Amino acid sequence: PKIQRTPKIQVYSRHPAENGKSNFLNCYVSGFHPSDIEVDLLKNGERIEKVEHSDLSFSKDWSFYLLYYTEFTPTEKDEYACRVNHVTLSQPKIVKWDRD
Amino acid sequence: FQGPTSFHVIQTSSFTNSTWAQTQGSGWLDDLQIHGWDSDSGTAIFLKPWSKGNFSDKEVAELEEIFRVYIFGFAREVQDFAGDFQMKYPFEIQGIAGCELHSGGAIVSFLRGALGGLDFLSVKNASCVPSPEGGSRAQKFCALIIQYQGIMETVRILLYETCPRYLLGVLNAGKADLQRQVKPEAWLSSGPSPGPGRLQLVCHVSGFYPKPVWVMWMRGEQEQQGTQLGDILPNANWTWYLRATLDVADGEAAGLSCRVKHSSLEGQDIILYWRGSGLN
Ligand SMILES: *[C@@H]1O[C@H](CO[C@@H]2O[C@@H](C)[C@@H](O)[C@@H](O)[C@@H]2O)[C@@H](O[C@@H]2O[C@H](CO)[C@@H](O[C@@H]3O[C@H](CO[C@H]4O[C@H](CO)[C@@H](O)[C@H](O)[C@@H]4O)[C@@H](O)[C@H](O[C@H]4O[C@H](CO)[C@@H](O)[C@H](O)[C@@H]4O)[C@@H]3O)[C@H](O)[C@H]2NC(C)=O)[C@H](O[C@@H]2O[C@@H](C)[C@@H](O)[C@@H](O)[C@@H]2O)[C@H]1NC(C)=O
Ligand SMILES: CCCCCCCCCCCCC/C=C\[C@H](O)[C@@H](COP(=O)(O)OCC[N+](C)(C)C)NC(=O)CCCCCCCCCCCCCCC
Ligand SMILES: *[C@@H]1O[C@H](CO)[C@@H](O[C@@H]2O[C@H](CO)[C@@H](O)[C@H](O)[C@H]2NC(C)=O)[C@H](O)[C@H]1NC(C)=O
Ligand SMILES: [Cl-]
Ligand SMILES: [Cl-]
Ligand SMILES: [Cl-]
Ligand SMILES: [Cl-]
Numbered sequence: 001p002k003i004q005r006t007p008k009i010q011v012y013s014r015h016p017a018e019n020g021k022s023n024f025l026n027c028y029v030s031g032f033h034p035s036d037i038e039v040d041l042l043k044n045g046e047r048i049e050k051v052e053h054s055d056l057s058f059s060k061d062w063s064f065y066l067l068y069y070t071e072f073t074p075t076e077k078d079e080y081a082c083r084v085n086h087v088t089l090s091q092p093k094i095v096k097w098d099r100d
Numbered sequence: 101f102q103g104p105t106s107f108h109v110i111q112t113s114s115f116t117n118s119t120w121a122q123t124q125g126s127g128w129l130d131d132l133q134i135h136g137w138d139s140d141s142g143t144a145i146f147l148k149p150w151s152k153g154n155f156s157d158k159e160v161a162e163l164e165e166i167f168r169v170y171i172f173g174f175a176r177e178v179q180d181f182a183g184d185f186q187m188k189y190p191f192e193i194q195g196i197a198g199c200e201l202h203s204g205g206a207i208v209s210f211l212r213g214a215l216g217g218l219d220f221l222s223v224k225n226a227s228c229v230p231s232p233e234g235g236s237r238a239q240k241f242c243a244l245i246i247q248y249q250g251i252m253e254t255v256r257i258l259l260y261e262t263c264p265r266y267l268l269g270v271l272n273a274g275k276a277d278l279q280r281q282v283k284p285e286a287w288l289s290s291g292p293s294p295g296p297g298r299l300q301l302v303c304h305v306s307g308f309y310p311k312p313v314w315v316m317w318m319r320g321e322q323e324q325q326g327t328q329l330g331d332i333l334p335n336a337n338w339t340w341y342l343r344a345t346l347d348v349a350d351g352e353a354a355g356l357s358c359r360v361k362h363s364s365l366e367g368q369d370i371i372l373y374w375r376g377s378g379l380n
C-alpha cells in the first residue's frame with residue numbers, strides 16, 4: 001500500500017481541430033493512486049465552469065482513471081489546458097492542448 | 101455478437117482516519133458505465149433505460165439493500181480490525197466483482213480485492229484466497245470473514261447464480277446501444293521525431309464503436325510493421341480514440357498511407373494519404 005502513483009495526463013480533442021467549429025476537449029487522467037484528485041479544464045488559464053467527468057474507475061493494476069470533458073470552439077489564439085492536482089504533485093500540473 | 105461481454109461492480113473505499121471512510125461504487129459493462137452508486141441516498145443510479153436488464157424492481161431493490169448493508173458494515177469491520185493487523189492511515193481498498201461471457205457460451209465469475217493498490221485477495225471456487233502481495237494480513241483477513249455468518253454464502257449466490265443471469269438479461273435488454281455501429285473519422289498529423297532526419301507521422305482515429313479496430317500505416321498494400329499503437333482513449337458518449345504513429349526518415353515519408361478497418365464501415369476502409377512539403 002505504501003507507494004503512490006503520479007497521474008498520467010493526456011489532452012485531446014474529439015474531432016480534428018478547426019477554427020470556428022465546435023468540438024470537445026478531453027482530458028484523460030490515469031495511472032494514479034490514491035484516488036483523491038482534482039481536475040480542471042482551462043480556457044486561457046481560467047477554469048472552465050461547464051465540465052463533465054466520468055465516475056471513478058480503475059485499471060487491472062488498480063490504478064485510477066478519470067475522463068473530464070467540455071465542448072469548446074478552437075480558435076487561432078485561444079489556449080486550452082488540463083490542470084491536475086494530486087498528492088504526488090507538489091504544484092498543480094498543467095498539460096496544454098496541442099492540436100498539432 | 102459485438103460489444104461488451106462482461107458485467108462488473110467496483111468499490112473504492114477510502115479510509116482517512118479511525119473515524120472517517122467513504123466508499124464509491126459503480127456498475128460496468130466492460131468499460132461502459134451502466135450503474136452509479138449514490139452515497140447521498142444509499143441507492144443505485146440507473147444510467148440507461150435498460151440498466152435493470154430483465155430483473156424485476158423487487159429484485160433490484162433487494163440487491164441495492166445488500167450493497168447498502170455491505171458498504172456500511174465493510175467500513176465498520178475494517179475500522180474495528182485496523183487495530184488488529186497494524187494498518188497506518190490513510191489507506192484505500194478496492195474491489196471488483198462480476199462475470200463474463202466466453203466463446204462457447206460459458207459464463208465465468210470473478211472477485212478481487214486490493215489494498216493500497218496491490219492485490220490482496222480473490223474468490224476462487226467460492227473460497228477466500230489471499231494473494232501473496234497481501235501477506236499474512238490477507239491470510240488473517242480470509243480466515244476472519246469465512247467465520248462471519250452468511251457472508252461467503254451471499255457472495256457465492258451473487259457471483260455464481262445472480263450475476264450470470266443478470267449479465268444475459270442486460271446484454272439483451274441493451275443490445276440496441278451495446279451492439280450499435282458508429283463509424284470513426286480519421287486524420288493525419290506530423291511533428292518532429294527524435295534523431296537526425298527523422299519524422300513522426302500520426303494517424304488519428306476517433307469516434308468509433310465498438311472498441312475493436314485495425315489501424316496500420318501502409319506503403320501500397322505493404323503494412324508497415326513499425327506502426328506503434330497508442331493506448332485506446334475514451335470519448336464521452338461511448339466511442340473511442342486511437343493514435344497510430346510511424347517513425348520515418350525524412351524523404352522516405354512519401355508513399356505512406358494510413359488504413360482504418362472497422363466493423364461499422366461495411367468493408368469501406370478509410371485510407372488516408374500522406375503528402376509532403378506542407379501539402380498536408
Ligand atoms: C433473465 O434472463 C436470463 C437469461 O434468459 C435467457 O436469455 C435471454 C437473453 C433471453 O433470451 C431469455 O428469453 C432467455 O430465457 C434468465 O435465466 C435463464 O432462465 C432460463 C429459463 O428459466 C433457464 O433455463 C433453465 O435451465 C435449466 C438448466 O440450467 C442448468 O444447466 C445449464 C446448462 O444446461 C447451466 O447453464 C445452468 O447454469 C444450470 O446449471 C433447465 O433445467 C431448465 O429446464 C426446465 O425448464 C424448461 C423451460 O424453461 C423445460 O423445457 C425443461 O424441460 C425443464 O422443465 C431451463 O431450461 C436458464 O438456465 C437461465 N440462465 C441462467 C444463466 O441463469 C432469467 O430467468 C430467471 O432465472 C432462471 C435461473 C430461472 O430461475 C428462471 O425461472 C428465472 O425467471 C431471467 N430473469 C432473471 C430475473 O434473471
Ligand atoms: C470476500 C469479500 C467479502 C468480505 C467483506 C466482509 C465485510 C462484511 C460487511 C458486511 C456485513 C453484513 C451484515 C451481516 C450479514 C448480512 O446480512 C449478509 C447476509 O445476511 P443473512 O441472510 O445472513 O442475515 C439476514 C440479514 N438480512 C435480513 C439483512 C438479509 N449479507 C452480506 O454479507 C453481503 C455480502 C457482500 C457481497 C459483495 C459483492 C459480492 C459479488 C457481487 C457480484 C455482482 C453480481 C450482482 C448482479 C447485480
Ligand atoms: C478524521 O477526519 C475528519 C475530516 O475528514 C476530521 O473532521 C474534523 O475534526 C476536527 C476535530 O474535531 C474538527 O475541528 C473539524 O471541523 C472536522 N472537519 C470536518 C470537515 O468535519 C475528524 O475529526 C478526524 N477524526 C479523528 C479521530 O482524527
Ligand atoms: Cl466495446
Ligand atoms: Cl451508502
Ligand atoms: Cl442472496
Ligand atoms: Cl475520414
Ligand code: NI
Nearest residue numbers: 088089090091
Ligand atoms: Ni511535480
